[PDB]
From a paper:
Microtubules (MTs) are cytoskeleton polymers built from αβ-tubulin heterodimers that associate head-to-tail to form polar protofilaments (PFs) and laterally to form the hollow MT wall. They are central to many aspects of cell biology, acting as tracks for molecular motors and generating force via their dynamic growth and shrinkage. Furthermore, the structures of most MTs polymerised in vitro, as well as those found in many in vivo situations, include a single discontinuity – called the seam – in the otherwise helical arrangement of their subunits. This seam is composed of heterotypic α-β and β-α lateral contacts and standard Fourier helical methods cannot be used to determine the structure of such MTs.
Furthermore, the alternating α- and β-tubulin subunits are structurally very similar and are thus challenging to distinguish except at near-atomic resolutions. Binding partners attached every tubulin dimer act as fiducial markers and greatly facilitate structural discrimination between α- and β-tubulin. Although it is unknown whether the seam itself has any particular function, common MTs architectures with seams (particularly 13 PF MTs), are composed of protofilaments that follow a relatively straight path along the MT axis, which is speculated to support efficient motor protein transport. The determination of the αβ-tubulin register and seam location during image processing is essential for alignment accuracy that enables determination of biologically relevant structures. Here we present a pipeline designed for image processing and high-resolution reconstruction of cryo-electron microscopy microtubule datasets, based in the popular and user-friendly RELION image-processing package, Microtubule RELION-based Pipeline (MiRP). The pipeline uses a combination of supervised classification and prior knowledge about geometric lattice constraints in microtubules to accurately determine microtubule architecture and seam location. The presented method is fast and semi-automated, producing near-atomic resolution reconstructions with test datasets that contain a range of microtubule architectures and binding proteins.
Numbering used by the authors:
A (entry chain N): 44 to 142
B (entry chain B), C (entry chain b): 1 to 429
Write the structure that this text describes.
Amino acid sequence: QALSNEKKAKKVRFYRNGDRYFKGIVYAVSSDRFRSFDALLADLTRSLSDNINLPQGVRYIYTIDGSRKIGSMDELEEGESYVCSSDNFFKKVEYTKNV
Amino acid sequence: MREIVHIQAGQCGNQIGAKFWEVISDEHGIDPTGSYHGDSDLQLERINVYYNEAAGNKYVPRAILVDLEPGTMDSVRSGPFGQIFRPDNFVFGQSGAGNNWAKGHYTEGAELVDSVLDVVRKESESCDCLQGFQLTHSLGGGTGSGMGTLLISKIREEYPDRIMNTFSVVPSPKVSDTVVEPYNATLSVHQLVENTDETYCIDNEALYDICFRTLKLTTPTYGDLNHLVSATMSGVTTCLRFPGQLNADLRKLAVNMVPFPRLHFFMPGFAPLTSRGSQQYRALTVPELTQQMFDAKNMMAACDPRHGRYLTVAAVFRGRMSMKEVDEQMLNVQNKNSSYFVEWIPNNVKTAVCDIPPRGLKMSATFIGNSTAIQELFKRISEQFTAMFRRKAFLHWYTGEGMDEMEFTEAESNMNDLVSEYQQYQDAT
Amino acid sequence: MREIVHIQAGQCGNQIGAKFWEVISDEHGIDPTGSYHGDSDLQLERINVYYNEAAGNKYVPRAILVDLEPGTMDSVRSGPFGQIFRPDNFVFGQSGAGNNWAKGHYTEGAELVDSVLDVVRKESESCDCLQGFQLTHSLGGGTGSGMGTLLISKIREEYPDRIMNTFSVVPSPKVSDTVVEPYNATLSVHQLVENTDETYCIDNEALYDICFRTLKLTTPTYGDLNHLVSATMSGVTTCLRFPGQLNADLRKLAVNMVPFPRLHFFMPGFAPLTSRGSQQYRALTVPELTQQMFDAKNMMAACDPRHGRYLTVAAVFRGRMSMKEVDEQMLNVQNKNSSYFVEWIPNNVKTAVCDIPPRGLKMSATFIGNSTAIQELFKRISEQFTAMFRRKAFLHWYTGEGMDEMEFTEAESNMNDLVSEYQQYQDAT
Ligand SMILES: Nc1nc2c(ncn2[C@@H]2O[C@H](COP(=O)(O)OP(=O)(O)O)[C@@H](O)[C@H]2O)c(=O)[nH]1
Ligand SMILES: Nc1nc2c(ncn2[C@@H]2O[C@H](COP(=O)(O)OP(=O)(O)O)[C@@H](O)[C@H]2O)c(=O)[nH]1
């Protein structure tokens, strides 16, 4: 065959922690652009923090709910947002309101 | 008032604009410093439409230059009339387009489109009465197809009343300057038919013939090709910047030339175009300038107008001339070529007459002719799309950027809706 | 009359002041000797506010310089405009702060605070009508947090009517120039909310961005960072030293900007700030200076004002300009950003217009904007305090200087009272 496995990008949103006035940039997350989950933290580093957020960088990715720590890239699903934090403590504000 | 904000995009649209602002500065008399060295006070009266007066009798262009890599912006600031632009307006990223619509529109455009709109909104507030925007890009590359059409959708959501015209460069049919140009063209025409008002389709192949055949040039560089596009772009707004006997502007052409909210792809045309030695064996009269605007060898979109019918014709003249001599010729080419015009639109010629000629000549013209002859241009894009999509080749570069196969279906189906419309109004009754 | 006594403290507040007195001497025309070489007689008319006339047409600054070790005072007297200070005012100890609030406030401050107040009381009697004091320190180090807040309490017990304003440097959130800076900040904000009148919070991180982004500097030393703070400090009292059309002073800003006896932490802002080459692509008008004072990229406290609402706004302009052109812009930014202002205070903009510009420019400004956006600044101090206090770490250096754990409780509880107040007046009705 030649019509291959259709190397597909998930369209997931990334709310950064605490920032209520932020929308979350949809990343073309695939298994082709990141061989490991630890490489996904590297792309989240520059394109989330600009002047006022995250001195520790990017360590812990939570769910939008959030009650679970995201492991590898297999624990992600198509079309759901995720709260990107950098500490064990979680901030419970309304992220998904008025996308 | 009636100020215009100029937006450039891609490698192509920057180098068109980098010659375009040289042409505008030749009319209004602006040195490469930015000061004024003119002779007539008519140059400074309507100067605000493309300029903002800085402190100390210096004028800056109202331009916004956009790219995804600094390989082109460094060429602009280094060339002549490169010091004239403001250093704040050079908005550019680092990743580069990669000659990809999906990188230009979704991923790398999103990291830059917020930085551009702050420059857009800053220039929109400084103008008193905003006339409308204009854009110069190309449908072949990555940035001019992706980053440009992203900027059109963000502007139209914030300005649902201003006019929005694009001097898009449609790729030529015979040679192909890009392997994936049927994908970049098809995925951008879907954006242009829903968010613009009028669009001036320009093909590269038609510009090579005019320098070769008509102007008799030996070594046509792009500085001689872009000088014909820039002379056309000045000729559209030349009645907005100067007094004239019968005046039109970007609004009146958007009402006259566009009878339906989709059918708004034009073809330009310029006259006179002499040679370097044959410019003495020719008398510059209005019937001479008329019989050069209408033949097939002086279009700029690669399509012979004889295959279809015209719908509307704009003929913006420049220089002092008789109005009777204009109105006789615009009737004369409408009677004898009566089959080549559409029937249910009578008196389908819009005329505008300025007063001040271009620098060097005595009288000039500018042909803006809508036609059904651009159904051939969207046959070849729609055919070469389906020839490359039925095998699903060159597709994994677009799927990995967050896109599905359904997006290719609705973009292609939107184009065959458009060719069915130009086919319908060719055989009306 | 209306004389001001200037007090400096810490390594930071001395080097801010050592550039500040260079700026004031550039306006009034004072050589490094101390004589006068001006051109206009307006410089000598209000000279008494920051000077005492010595015998022989020489002027000395009314300054009090305080440190705990002579490692910084030797740098002041050796630099340019270091001979201008009087040798009696250099009050300094020998033990050194050790970068410790408990050493700076209780133990080693007590051996020096009596020597400072004799210099304070000597300068207070020599003035005719005392306007008020001002202080420059920092909340991060040892001396500026401990010795400074001890001097504020001793002054307020002896002068319960004069105005007392501090240009405190609040530590930046991302980088940390001191390990124990959540302790030095929290134990000093408890002193500042009860014994001052207004306080200009300045962050280091915001000053690095302005030199990098806005001024386009390559190697910003502190002489280029402190020159922006000193230009702000001159701009607050610039109507008190010069005639103007509409005049304000340190008293009128303390009435207008402060609607409640606690909510008095401000954020400064200066305009215009050009580049070294981009200063010609810009027209210096009042609507140009207006649209630079309000955006987020030209604050000095590291907090975006869009997260909260403003309460009061002071806009001290300099140079000759139209009052109508000022009053139109201060209405214009209040209508379109109607959500960004608090509702139950109508016409929340205080305007002051001087006449004499700074040395070199034509017109300038000074933004003093109170906001609820500094609730973010006291989130990060209160969080980093409790992150370091619940383990009781770095604590034995403070217990051995005569302090209990209860003092940390009331200082932290005073701060969460303050964040509850700015939260309450963000959602009033
Ligand atoms: N007419 C004209 N077309 C140009 C010029 N330079 C590039 N192009 C066109 O631009 C296209 C190539 O894309 P490019 O300019 O790199 O744009 P981008 O890839 O979207 O940034 C082709 O269709 C070229 O014919 C020029 O000077 N004149
Ligand atoms: N803006 C600014 N801050 C300074 C300067 N010098 C030191 N600082 C700040 O001062 C603090 C360090 O404390 P220090 O100056 O030694 O004061 P002390 O320890 O209380 O005597 C840090 O927050 C530095 O950022 C300067 O020239 N400019």
